[PDB]
Amino acid sequence: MLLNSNELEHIHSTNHSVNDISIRWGVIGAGQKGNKEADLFAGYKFSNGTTCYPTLAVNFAESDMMHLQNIIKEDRIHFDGLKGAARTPSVVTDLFDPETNPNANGYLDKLAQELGRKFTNEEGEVIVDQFLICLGAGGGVGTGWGSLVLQLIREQFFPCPVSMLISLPSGDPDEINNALVLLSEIDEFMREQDRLFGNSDIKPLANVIVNDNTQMQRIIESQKGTKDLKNRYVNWKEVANDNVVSTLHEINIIPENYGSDNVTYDPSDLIKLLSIPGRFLTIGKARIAKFDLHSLENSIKRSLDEGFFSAEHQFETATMYGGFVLRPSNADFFKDVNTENRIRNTLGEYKRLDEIAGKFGDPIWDNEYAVCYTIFAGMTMPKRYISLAREGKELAEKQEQLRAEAQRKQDEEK
Amino acid sequence: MLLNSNELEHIHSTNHSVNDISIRWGVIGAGQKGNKEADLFAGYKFSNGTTCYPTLAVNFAESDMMHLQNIIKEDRIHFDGLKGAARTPSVVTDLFDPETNPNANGYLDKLAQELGRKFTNEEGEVIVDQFLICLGAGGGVGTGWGSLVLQLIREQFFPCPVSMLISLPSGDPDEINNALVLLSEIDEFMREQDRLFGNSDIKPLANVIVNDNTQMQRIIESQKGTKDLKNRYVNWKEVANDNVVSTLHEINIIPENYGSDNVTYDPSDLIKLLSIPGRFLTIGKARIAKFDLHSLENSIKRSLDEGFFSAEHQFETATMYGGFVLRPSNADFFKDVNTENRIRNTLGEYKRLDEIAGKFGDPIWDNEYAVCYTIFAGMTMPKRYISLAREGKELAEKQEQLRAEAQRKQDEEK
Amino acid sequence: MLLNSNELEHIHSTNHSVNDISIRWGVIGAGQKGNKEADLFAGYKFSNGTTCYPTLAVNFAESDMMHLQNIIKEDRIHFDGLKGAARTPSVVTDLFDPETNPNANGYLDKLAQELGRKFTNEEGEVIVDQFLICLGAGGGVGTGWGSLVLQLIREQFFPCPVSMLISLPSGDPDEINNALVLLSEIDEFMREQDRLFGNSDIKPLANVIVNDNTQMQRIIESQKGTKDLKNRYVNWKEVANDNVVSTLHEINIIPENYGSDNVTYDPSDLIKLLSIPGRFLTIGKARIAKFDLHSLENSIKRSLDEGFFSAEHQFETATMYGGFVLRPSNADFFKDVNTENRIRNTLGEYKRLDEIAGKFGDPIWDNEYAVCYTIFAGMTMPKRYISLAREGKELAEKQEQLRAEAQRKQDEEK
Amino acid sequence: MLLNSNELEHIHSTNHSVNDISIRWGVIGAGQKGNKEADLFAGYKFSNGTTCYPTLAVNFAESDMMHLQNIIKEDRIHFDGLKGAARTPSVVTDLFDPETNPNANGYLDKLAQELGRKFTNEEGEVIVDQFLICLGAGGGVGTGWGSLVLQLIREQFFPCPVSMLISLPSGDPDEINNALVLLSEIDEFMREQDRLFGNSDIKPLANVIVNDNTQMQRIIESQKGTKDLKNRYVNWKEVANDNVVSTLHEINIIPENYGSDNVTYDPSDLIKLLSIPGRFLTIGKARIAKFDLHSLENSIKRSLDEGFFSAEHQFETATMYGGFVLRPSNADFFKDVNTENRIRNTLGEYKRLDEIAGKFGDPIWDNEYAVCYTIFAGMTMPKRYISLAREGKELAEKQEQLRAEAQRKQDEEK
Numbered sequence A, B, C, D: 001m002l003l004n005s006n007e008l009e010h011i012h013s014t015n016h017s018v019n020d021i022s023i024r025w026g027v028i029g030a031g032q033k034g035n036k037e038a039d040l041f042a043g044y045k046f047s048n049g050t051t052c053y054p055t056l057a058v059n060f061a062e063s064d065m066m067h068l069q070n071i072i073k074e075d076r077i078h079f080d081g082l083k084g085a086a087r088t089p090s091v092v093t094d095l096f097d098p099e100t101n102p103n104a105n106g107y108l109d110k111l112a113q114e115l116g117r118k119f120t121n122e123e124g125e126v127i128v129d130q131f132l133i134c135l136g137a138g139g140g141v142g143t144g145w146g147s148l149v150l151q152l153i154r155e156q157f158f159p160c161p162v163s164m165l166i167s168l169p170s171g172d173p174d175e176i177n178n179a180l181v182l183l184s185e186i187d188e189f190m191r192e193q194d195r196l197f198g199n200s201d202i203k204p205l206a207n208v209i210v211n212d213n214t215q216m217q218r219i220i221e222s223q224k225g226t227k228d229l230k231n232r233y234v235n236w237k238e239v240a241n242d243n244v245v246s247t248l249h250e251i252n253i254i255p256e257n258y259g260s261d262n263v264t265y266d267p268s269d270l271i272k273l274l275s276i277p278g279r280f281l282t283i284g285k286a287r288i289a290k291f292d293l294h295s296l297e298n299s300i301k302r303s304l305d306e307g308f309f310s311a312e313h314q315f316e317t318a319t320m321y322g323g324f325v326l327r328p329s330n331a332d333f334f335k336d337v338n339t340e341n342r343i344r345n346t347l348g349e350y351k352r353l354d355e356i357a358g359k360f361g362d363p364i365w366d367n368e369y370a371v372c373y374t375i376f377a378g379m380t381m382p383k384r385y386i387s388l389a390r391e392g393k394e395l396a397e398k399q400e401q402l403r404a405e406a407q408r409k410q411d412e413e414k
């Protein structure tokens, strides 16, 4: 268990029966980023110190996996032999493709194996609910795997659905491409399946969660760090991560361990919520320590807008909503209805919930502020896609410039 | 005086007439643990810096007693000669048993003596109320003494009753046994006496207070320690201890030095409370800084459940209740009756108080939160006993496994 | 972006759309002081980390400009050749005066140039609103430039108005003089223009903001610094500065990014406010975390009196008022009218606002206290001028004393 | 007393009551190496300059024993007559075997005798705890004796157990053989006894400590010697030795003379530790002067891996663990629990301690760094055995080559 939020604390300080989750994610962490996250996920144990999620970490080589603080070598999968690579994801693919790599398959086995190892007990049962695959884009490894997975799922190695945690980078046109295309492909896929399935079907691809780094850094600095001191010694990712994960984590806990005396969110919701939309999903966590409609709105707005996962996704491309407000039970001001209404309406502004599926919870806690967790799902494409698009152009060219300028510098010299 | 709680502080900051206790415990601290505790007890002095409890520390050898910060060598009793021992408590027994150790008696004298030294003044009067013997189980020394005491009491060396502070360890089947049996014997004894006495009789064995380490550690980490920094440098016991003792300590102080404008707990209560049940006793200290019935309940629940002394004792095997809520006098919300009722009822759920003896206090302070001290007494057996039972089996076997597995490893090699 | 106030934080934590200012100051920082400030100004970037003001730093030589943390050499203008100088501002003047320095003009070009560089984009457009020239008096460089500017403006190199940030020193008669005369000249100028213009005219000299160091230090120590620890390691200027700038800075932000649900201050106001009075302007920022008329008054009073910019300026020599209270929107106590009235009246005591121009805002925030920004403009002469006058006399003579005394010491010895 | 480590110093500088050991080794030093070591052991005296271990030195002839700096001729046992020998250990055996050497026995007597002389006082009591026999392999003398001992023990001349200090050489196939076989035999023996005994039995062969020279030299040079100057004049063994012995030595001292305020290692542990595993034992001493989990790990790792005694022994062939960290008592960072855990886990990676016996201490000192002594016991076979195996083949053949090549050189010439 790693608390790392007031909240978390609050929780933990309060309940200690926390031994219980909603969804058994099978954390496969790929690439620096993923791994890194994974360790955090890894950090969760219960109120009996029992891990929460089961986690494999993958990376190409061993060394790659040294700084992990929870992962053991066994869970450090790597495939090794050749030194160096071109960070093309095409390396990866090879290694499992007979044609390039005959022993392709050899590897696969071991994956299948370790999967077995890790995800069976001895019922041979998969002890997983959905695969949570974590990726940071531009990471060859990730990218390679990404696709890989798509196949694999098909190839039934994966019989749980996949949830994709994708970070959208910042800069570097190359990455941009890699990413975009990656996203594209996915997107296709996404599109295919709904019409390939019904639309009430378990989506093998449950949803996609994206994060923008850029945005985040900005945010991060926003939040200053004279509010603490070691802040003054931190890395943004390091923080970022915390939030991110925590959120997720948290929300998994909360319904499970909490109740309300009024509307009750629940796992199933989540399940629903997570599977079926199949697409782009976003979450807003809003501290609410100030108590009025206007501010409510603000923080709402803020939370959405100045959401952490925010990517300028196109709200009305959502189809489904969710979230809940964990509110103190003495917090009358919320008990009031107007509020609710207000809220409703508030949200309605980005698209009216009431045209789509979703629900909302309002749990109790005994905190001294409330946090509103908000989730919009099944969206398609965030405008960032575009922005990215534009930007890498605006980059590409920008160093074309630099290329031409200084091609001139060649000419200019004897 | 060592404060080490807000409370304690609060107290101390408030009253300074604290020169006064309810019960004169005679702290005999046996074994690492006991000693350690003892030092803390030892740390108490009055508002005139006058010690609170008188304390002997026992250990086998001198060195054993070095790190103590309050104990003087004089109060470091040890009996020495042979180097090393098997940590069998059977060592101890010998030393006072003529048959094994002829000079058995020689020692006894010195005990009797130092007891004299320490517990008489020069009225020859025992300046004690009840012996508080502190033990951590699995400690040969403790264990040896434990039994020893039973005899000794009989042997009238002890003319105050004994209260046993027992820690129940965590792991190691051996200990487990030692313990269990120890507990067993005690248990017997306990059983005997009530029927050996009346049931309205001064129980020579006033009660037993157990603590589970395991539980505690868990708890401890629960309580995080980013709430403080040096926390980030602490040992659980170190904290644990603090609580534990403090509690006790505290509660001894409080009635004595406090009043109420309503129901008044008092020493006698305590006395009653402590003597007669003769058996398993538990305490819940509940911060109440949140003010509603539900939360009241929660914290109640919490406190019981996620009590510190908690061991899954069998509530209805209690016979007697007590405790008090030290509440701020401006704290109207408590003044209200409903509350009381509520409380009553709340407790009623684990067994209905109103079928048994006990009482309850509600003192004032001028704190800005309240703490509810809750005591259930005269219980018999906590399910942990069992759990322990199961566990050591689950251990024993588990390393039988390891024994057989690797007996195989012998066979497997040439 | 550098936050450095709760407020700032509050702001920043709240809005992150802060990408937007009211007035584009063109910060020219002259002399140690100015530079220093400039760096701070320089520290501002937006919610997209986009600088706020554009800034040139001037100093005589390069080295002079080393410790700057944001200024780049390019923005470190210096003119160099001769080593040492007499800190006469008459050095400066020379350098741009053909007669003394034929290549006078050469320099000017570069100024004009860098001005170009810095203040055009490629529309050749000036990207500035008003020049904010920062000076600490007694600084030869500053002083030289001061005058220089007056000319330059005339000489149309400056086509934005100038706002002068002048610090009034503490001690040293020489400085005093330099200053006074400087002030005098300015004063003249000020006087001229109004009658040289209409009085409804864009004043090329928008206003003057003075700061007294002396006063400030006093204040500073007032504010203690056990309230923080590093305080215990600070320099007054360092703090001072922070305030000062911040204030300014802040106020530029706030209207721009904030609204109210009631009276709305706005840039134009500011503009008006800043241009037309042409003269002495002062600002009071009042935390209001205590909620009553009396205290309101107090803090008001305090703020004025024990304003930061305060110089014993002659209120009724003002002609124009402004400011706004950034108040929490839940802060009902302000919503109330009486309050307003009260305020009005309060201010009325130093001169009645209602005889002059100005306005006042009351924005919302969601802070948990309010800050009242108060501005009195178009004043002429603060009594400090005088005080200064007296003091340097009281100095001059005082070391005349010392001169005569110890001229005696010459005589007294063989 | 010879200090020769900071530590040792630290110790000695601190305590001077050092008059006290854990285990009375009876140092029999055989062969150059052993002797050499012995002298060092010999160098230990107490804080009252009282020798620590009692030591016989054996060698074949007198001259052999000249450079010893502590050994007296009396303790220079040699058996002499014939000049030269074939360094076959078979020489040795003869000398005590009636059949080859009738007067075999004559010698034996003298051994028995001097043993008597040296190891009785006049209680006729053996003043020994365990025989510490030191050997460097390939040393005929050693080797001969090795076996000899096995018999002798059986032959009850030895009634203390034997601990074998074996150096594994570097190169020379012959040695290799001699060694291997030696090791083999031993190994057998080892295997026999456990099944010959119970497994909870005092192993007559307490354990085996091996050292690799090769490894060591490498290490040695690693540690540079511009860190000192005379280093620049040293022999590796000379250093090596120091460490080695010292370690041992040290660890014998430390528990004995130190305490902790927390977990306490102790002799018994050692005893246990040393006797019962009967097999391969290894030790890691880790300076810890850097304070974080990662580094902790590192040094841990390092220490294990880049242990001094390290031989690529097969961790999981261990059965038993031990060690302790002598840490400064002000060293909070260790006091913290996480740490502990971490550690635990860390170790767990090579095999999980928690499946096997052992314990761990954490003593105080007042050093300004900590040293972690780590012990893995009861292992069987280190991969070096193998490596050796391979290598001598790789040698044997390699000079077969040279043999054939240059057999060709014969043919090639007339």
Ligand SMILES: Nc1nc2c(ncn2[C@@H]2O[C@H](COP(=O)(O)OP(=O)(O)O)[C@@H](O)[C@H]2O)c(=O)[nH]1
Residues within 6 Å of the ligand: A030, A031, A032, A033, A034, A036, A037, A087, A135, A136, A137, A138, A139, A140, A141, A142, A167, A168, A169, A170, A213, A237, A240, A241
């Ligand atoms: N925020 C964050 N991004 C990371 C982290 N590690 C890597 N990334 C990002 O993930 C993307 C791909 O890099 P990486 O994960 O190293 O890919 P790899 O080279 O395939 O291992 C880049 O945008 C990295 O900045 C991480 O732990 N957190």
Ligand SMILES: Nc1nc2c(ncn2[C@@H]2O[C@H](COP(=O)(O)OP(=O)(O)O)[C@@H](O)[C@H]2O)c(=O)[nH]1
Residues within 6 Å of the ligand: B030, B031, B032, B033, B034, B036, B037, B087, B135, B136, B137, B138, B139, B140, B141, B142, B167, B168, B169, B170, B213, B237, B240, B241
């Ligand atoms: N929490 C706690 N347990 C302790 C302390 N010292 C020892 N123990 C525990 O007491 C039990 C018996 O150990 P110990 O007191 O050393 O017994 P001894 O060997 O007879 O001195 C074990 O569970 C120890 O962990 C202490 O000061 N606090």
Ligand SMILES: Nc1nc2c(ncn2[C@@H]2O[C@H](COP(=O)(O)OP(=O)(O)O)[C@@H](O)[C@H]2O)c(=O)[nH]1
Residues within 6 Å of the ligand: C030, C031, C032, C033, C034, C036, C037, C087, C135, C136, C137, C138, C139, C140, C141, C142, C167, C168, C169, C170, C213, C237, C240, C241
């Ligand atoms: N508060 C403050 N005053 C300063 C600072 N630097 C210089 N001054 C003051 O400005 C006045 C003129 O000094 P300076 O700026 O060094 O002039 P220069 O010699 O022309 O560079 C003096 O009163 C200095 O104390 C600064 O950064 N802050």
Ligand SMILES: Nc1nc2c(ncn2[C@@H]2O[C@H](COP(=O)(O)OP(=O)(O)O)[C@@H](O)[C@H]2O)c(=O)[nH]1
Residues within 6 Å of the ligand: D030, D031, D032, D033, D034, D036, D037, D087, D135, D136, D137, D138, D139, D140, D141, D142, D167, D168, D169, D170, D213, D237, D240, D241
């Ligand atoms: N490190 C070390 N090895 C030694 C020393 N003396 C001898 N050896 C080694 O011990 C092994 C056997 O040689 P030695 O002791 O001379 O055997 P002997 O010929 O029977 O006396 C070889 O590997 C030697 O290098 C010593 O004092 N230290």
